[PDB]
Design a protein around this nucleic acid. Structure first.
Ligand SMILES: [Mg+2]
Ligand SMILES: [Mg+2]
Ligand SMILES: [Mg+2]
Ligand SMILES: [Mg+2]
Ligand SMILES: [Mg+2]
Ligand SMILES: [Mg+2]
Ligand SMILES: [Mg+2]
Ligand SMILES: [Mg+2]
Ligand SMILES: [Mg+2]
Ligand SMILES: [Mg+2]
Ligand SMILES: [Mg+2]
Ligand SMILES: [Mg+2]
Ligand SMILES: [Mg+2]
Ligand SMILES: [Mg+2]
Ligand SMILES: [Mg+2]
Ligand SMILES: [Mg+2]
Ligand SMILES: [Mg+2]
Ligand SMILES: [Mg+2]
Ligand SMILES: [Mg+2]
Ligand SMILES: [Mg+2]
Ligand SMILES: [Mg+2]
Ligand SMILES: [Mg+2]
Ligand SMILES: [Mg+2]
Ligand SMILES: [Mg+2]
Ligand SMILES: [Mg+2]
Ligand SMILES: [Mg+2]
Ligand SMILES: [Mg+2]
Ligand SMILES: [Mg+2]
Ligand SMILES: [Mg+2]
Ligand SMILES: [Mg+2]
Ligand SMILES: [Mg+2]
Ligand SMILES: [Mg+2]
Ligand SMILES: [Mg+2]
Ligand SMILES: [Mg+2]
Ligand SMILES: [Mg+2]
Ligand SMILES: [Mg+2]
Ligand SMILES: [Mg+2]
Ligand SMILES: [Zn+2]
Lengths: 80, 24, 118, 206, 60, 98, 127, 155
RNA sequence: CCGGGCACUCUAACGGGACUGCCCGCGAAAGCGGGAGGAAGGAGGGGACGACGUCUGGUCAGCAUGGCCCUUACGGCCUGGGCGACACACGUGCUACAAUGCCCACUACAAAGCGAUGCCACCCGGCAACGGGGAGCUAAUCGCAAAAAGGUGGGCCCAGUUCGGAUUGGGGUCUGCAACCCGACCCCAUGAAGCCGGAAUCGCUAGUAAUCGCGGAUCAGCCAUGCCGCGGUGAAUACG
């Protein structure tokens, strides 16, 4: 039960950046402070470092995780 | 009773509408 | 009265007795009785071989059911588990997923209480 | 921890609002803000002029700001000069084209807020508070005023520990709302601390 | 409360959702009545003063 | 049809203004239906007494907007001769819809 | 001709008109037994006429409104009482000793703050 | 009751019989403030009890409630250490209340499915001299005549 | 609905009305017991109101304020995150463990409030949340609106169930710049514990307890089962 209902929202920040990164070949680590945006298909293959609120953690983006968000793989919490 | 959201009493307790409690 | 992948209700009302199938609740039972053209208030014993065979025709292949449904749900768990998703982590640690509080009353998902000292 | 504000009790019977007009959903908020701005301005400037009550009334874009003064000479000013500046500064904040009105209050010792201001003044220059208290209650009692009461706050005379002062006279029944009990609060800001001054004055029956 | 935190008054909040009441007199952070523009403490004191017309002592 | 919507925070003020209007209009006009009273809009506000709890101490106040209706029938000139602007009350509020 | 009694019970109003007739009582376009169908206390509404031996001597038409149907029944009782008194005042001698002319002033009591419903206090545990 | 005698509430008479004990029993059957449903329970039970045995439910009700009323009971009194069970007689009002309470509690502790059936059969058994309510009554009375050794602690 | 009319219910402003006044009793008096009359009585019921002071009670984290520390810095903007963490422990509650019950149609009766892009009758689409269209109400006239328990009818048949809805998988609407952290809601499916609760402990003396729904403030939305009000039905018991 998760819903965006139309024009699935992806922030311009990484949108234009990655759609221009794809044109020159795959790039290495990217900078991401916007975990509010949705993952889109052409993101597969990169390595995206997202913000925990404190840290910068790299995430390998694959075909399986397209429908979800950036931040499902950056755990804010730390326990045990 | 009131917690069952797919029955009519659970619909009137939440005040919502649907298939198990149509409006009219 | 065998209908789906092995499923034998008996001695009750048919629409009620269909809830005992895995992928059928009251809604799908009413839908089966609706489109199959069968009296819902009938007992299971009085079900015609033709009525039973039509219920089998509909219920068997319109929705995914017992073994397929259990394996599909479990494989969905495994699917969002093998990915590094946070939801998969909540399924790993055995904690509620829908976004509840875990300070108190996480009993259903976390199991019986294991009381450490303090 | 008891004894709610007396004028808030009194608002219904034997007391009236400092603002009496009408509004709705879309108007009440900033109109009340404008009233607060008016009272703010008049408490900035007219404190030493001996003012007690500001009654603001509105019919329809008509404002009727009424200032009750113990000394109208400082409000009117020589040749009316001072009823020009701050009466224009009043309209330089609100574009409602508002006019100003003055009124006389007899016996400045009979109005409780004025007595509070007086005792707070004598406290700020650090007089013995109890003499100011009893003298104020006598000023009240020497002209009608079947009851009078004065309360002062802690750190009296600059003392480290906080205390509570006293010396009412007559009869001051805050419990029963019958007989037009007036109340005034003042704030004495001094080097040692802050002293609240409560002046209760009881006059009339019905 | 804090002066800068009344930044709502210049609203321009970059997003329409970020508008909160911020009781005018006391600069209330949490609990504000929208009809008076004041907060429960400021409303209490102002209704005690007698500057809010029509406000009486409720009793029944 | 001359509807006169009277509204206020004070009931005696409404009675004063409405009765003055009807007394003015009674010297010229018809068997005027006169001062009908309408239900009052009651806005209640519960406030916790002390800042920083003592939750169960709250007291409430109530504002009430009173409404009255006039409904003058067949007024011509002398009615509005005593109508233009002659009233004292300030807290009263008058509307006219036709 | 016709006699009138109003009565009132627990936020209910039951205008009662009594005339001579056979004993047929109607309410709001329904007979007395169709509108109050299956209510065990519905017989108490025509109880005030059993000290005067009506229902064969009388006939009624009632219009009731407000509250619940039990308050409607009791307001019907009181209204029948006052109509019976205005018909024949001597009936008072047999009415008030029965108690049918007394307005039941029991009203639901307002809810107070700090409580759940107007008297129930919230439960504390370990004082 | 520190000051006053706590004057007893005078219940309204009944619409069917005209008797007050019937209204009291119907109140004892009522729960959550449903006197209508409780009255329907008692009167369907009245029909059932008048049919299954060809007697008037009036006198059977009266005889049952009379059979369940006890004549002695026990109250605890603190004397010289831990308290003791002291027997004593019963007030008529308290006999009425206890009889009706035992009636309802023994009726609902019965196996019968419907409420009115439980009420009717409980009233029948109590009117015959047997049943659960009379068993609780006779246990209350068996508390007396047993600790009668404390008959000098009456108070 | 209309013509029309205020008698009625009603709405809301002023009044009348209860005072132990009448009688019996007891008493030195207040007063007490009983009775009539009365809508009502011995304070008719409910509020608002909380004394001199107490506990160095509570908050300078609402405000105002006396002193001591901060100054490319505690001040200041913004993004992200947090206040939602969990092997545990209590407090307050919500829903329940069913047959005086559940569900399904059908039908009747409240009071108090709220609504100018705000409440949204009505038609259409959709199983639905909801969307499109669109009338009216500056609201005793319009709308929220259906009250719910109840009534008759029906099915269930003592069974972890046509009890109970937690958990979880999927699909979807909506407010919003944006629902991973972390929203509500709808639909399909999954249908957990729980079959009246150990020691102990809580509320309530009359429309009260119990139960049933309704509304409101704050608020774009809402984790509100909270809080503050409203009425429906309506007890048990008080020897002491
Ligand atoms: Mg740990
Ligand atoms: Mg269910
Ligand atoms: Mg002053
Ligand atoms: Mg001094
Ligand atoms: Mg007074
Ligand atoms: Mg400050
Ligand atoms: Mg906000
Ligand atoms: Mg807010
Ligand atoms: Mg609270
Ligand atoms: Mg009430
Ligand atoms: Mg209630
Ligand atoms: Mg507490
Ligand atoms: Mg007409
Ligand atoms: Mg007349
Ligand atoms: Mg007497
Ligand atoms: Mg008497
Ligand atoms: Mg009497
Ligand atoms: Mg009283
Ligand atoms: Mg009183
Ligand atoms: Mg009273
Ligand atoms: Mg008093
Ligand atoms: Mg203190
Ligand atoms: Mg402390
Ligand atoms: Mg300061
Ligand atoms: Mg918290
Ligand atoms: Mg409608
Ligand atoms: Mg009108
Ligand atoms: Mg109308
Ligand atoms: Mg109108
Ligand atoms: Mg049935
Ligand atoms: Mg089990
Ligand atoms: Mg089940
Ligand atoms: Mg069972
Ligand atoms: Mg009491
Ligand atoms: Mg809301
Ligand atoms: Mg939540
Ligand atoms: Mg609610
Ligand atoms: Zn404030």
């Amino acid at each position: 039960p998760r819903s965006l209902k139309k024009g699935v929202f992806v922030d311009d920040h990484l949108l234009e950046k990655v759609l221009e990164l794809n044109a020159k070949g795959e790039k290495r680590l990217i900078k991401t402070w916007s975990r509010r945006s949705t993952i889109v298909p052409e993101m597969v293959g990169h390595t995206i470092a997202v913000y925990n609120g404190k840290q910068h953690v790299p995430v390998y983006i694959t075909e399986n995780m397209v429908g979800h968000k950036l931040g499902e793989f950056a755990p804010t919490r730390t326990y045990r | 009773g009131k917690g069952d959201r797919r029955t009519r009493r659970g619909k009137i307790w939440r005040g919502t509408y649907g298939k198990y409690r149509p409006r009219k | 009265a065998r209908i789906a992948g092995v499923e034998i209700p008996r001695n009750k009302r048919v629409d009620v007795a269909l809830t005992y199938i895995y992928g059928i609740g009251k809604a799908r039972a009413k839908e089966a009785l609706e489109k199959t053209g069968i009296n819902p208030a009938t007992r299971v014993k009085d079900l015609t071989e033709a009525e039973v065979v039509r219920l089998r025709e509909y219920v068997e292949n319109t929705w995914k059911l017992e073994g397929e449904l259990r394996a599909e749900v479990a494989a969905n768990i495994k699917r969002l588990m093998d990915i590094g998703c946070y939801r998969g982590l909540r399924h790993r640690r055995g904690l509620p997923v829908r976004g509840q509080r875990t300070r108190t009353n996480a009993r259903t998902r976390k199991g019986p209480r294991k009381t450490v000292a303090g | 921890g008891n004894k709610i504000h007396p004028i808030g009790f009194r608002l219904g019977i034997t007391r009236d609002w400092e603002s009496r007009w009408y509004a709705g959903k879309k108007q009440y908020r900033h109109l009340l803000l404008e009233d607060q701005r008016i009272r703010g301005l008049l408490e900035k400037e007219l404190y030493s002029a001996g003012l007690a009550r500001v009654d603001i009334e509105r019919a329809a874009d008509n404002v009727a700001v009424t200032v009750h003064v113990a000394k109208p000479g400082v409000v009117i000013g020589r040749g009316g000069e001072r009823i020009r500046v701050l009466r224009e500064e009043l309209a330089k904040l609100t574009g409602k084209n508002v006019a100003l009105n003055v009124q006389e209050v007899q016996n400045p010792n009979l109005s409780a807020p004025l007595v509070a201001q007086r005792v707070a003044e004598q406290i700020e220059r650090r007089f013995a508070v109890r003499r100011a208290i009893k003298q104020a209650v006598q000023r009240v009692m020497e002209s009608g005023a079947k009851g009078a009461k004065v309360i002062v706050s802690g750190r009296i005379g600059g003392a480290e520990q906080a205390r509570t002062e006293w010396a009412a006279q007559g009869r001051v029944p805050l419990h029963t709302l019958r007989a037009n009990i007036d109340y005034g609060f003042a704030l004495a800001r001094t080097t040692y601390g802050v002293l609240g001054v409560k002046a209760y004055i009881f006059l009339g029956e019905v | 409360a804090r002066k800068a935190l009344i930044e709502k008054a210049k609203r321009t909040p970059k997003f329409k959702v970020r508008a909160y009441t911020r009781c005018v007199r006391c600069g209330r952070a949490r609990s504000v009545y929208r009809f008076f523009g004041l907060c429960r403490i400021c409303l209490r004191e102002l209704a005690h003063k007698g500057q809010l017309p029509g406000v009486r002592k409720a009793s029944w | 049809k001359i509807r006169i919507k009277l509204r206020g925070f004070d009931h005696k003020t409404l009675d004063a203004s409405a009765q003055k209007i009807v007394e003015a209009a009674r010297r010229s006009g018809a068997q005027v239906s006169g001062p009908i009273p309408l239900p009052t809009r009651v806005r209640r506000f519960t406030v916790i007494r002390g800042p920083f709890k003592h939750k169960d101490s709250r007291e409430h106040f109530e504002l009430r907007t009173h409404n009255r209706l006039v409904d003058i029938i067949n007024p011509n000139r002398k009615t509005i001769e005593q109508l233009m602007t002659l009233d004292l009350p300030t807290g009263v509020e008058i509307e006219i819809k036709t | 001709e016709q006699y009138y009694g109003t009565g009132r019970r627990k936020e209910a109003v039951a205008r009662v008109f009594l005339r001579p007739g056979n004993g047929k009582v109607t309410v709001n376009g329904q007979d007395f037994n169709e509108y109050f169908q299956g209510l065990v206390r519905a017989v108490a509404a025509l109880e005030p006429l059993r000290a005067v031996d009506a229902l064969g001597h009388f006939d009624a038409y009632i219009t009731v409104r407000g509250g619940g149907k039990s308050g409607q029944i009791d307001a019907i009782k009181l209204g029948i009482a006052r109509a019976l008194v205005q018909y024949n005042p001597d009936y008072r001698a047999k009415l008030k000793p029965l108690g049918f002319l007394t307005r039941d002033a029991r009203v639901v009591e307002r809810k107070k703050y700090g409580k759940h419903k107007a008297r129930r206090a919230p439960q504390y545990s370990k004082r | 009751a520190r000051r006053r005698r706590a004057e007893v509430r005078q219940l309204q008479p009944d619409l069917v019989y005209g008797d007050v004990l019937v209204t009291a029993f119907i109140n004892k059957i009522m729960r959550d403030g449903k006197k209508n449903l409780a009255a329907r329970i008692f009167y369907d039970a009245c029909k059932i009890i008048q049919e299954k045995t060809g007697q008037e439910p009036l006198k059977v009700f009266k005889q049952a409630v009379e059979n369940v009323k006890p004549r002695m009971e026990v109250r605890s009194r603190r004397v010289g250490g831990a308290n003791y069970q002291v027997p004593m007689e019963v007030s008529p009002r308290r006999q009425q209340s206890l009889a009706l309470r035992w009636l309802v509690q023994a009726a609902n502790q019965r196996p019968e499915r419907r409420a009115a059936v439980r009420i009717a059969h409980e009233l029948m058994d109590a009117a015959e001299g047997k049943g659960g309510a009379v068993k609780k009554k006779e246990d209350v009375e068996r508390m007396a005549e047993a600790n009668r050794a404390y008959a000098h602690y009456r108070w």
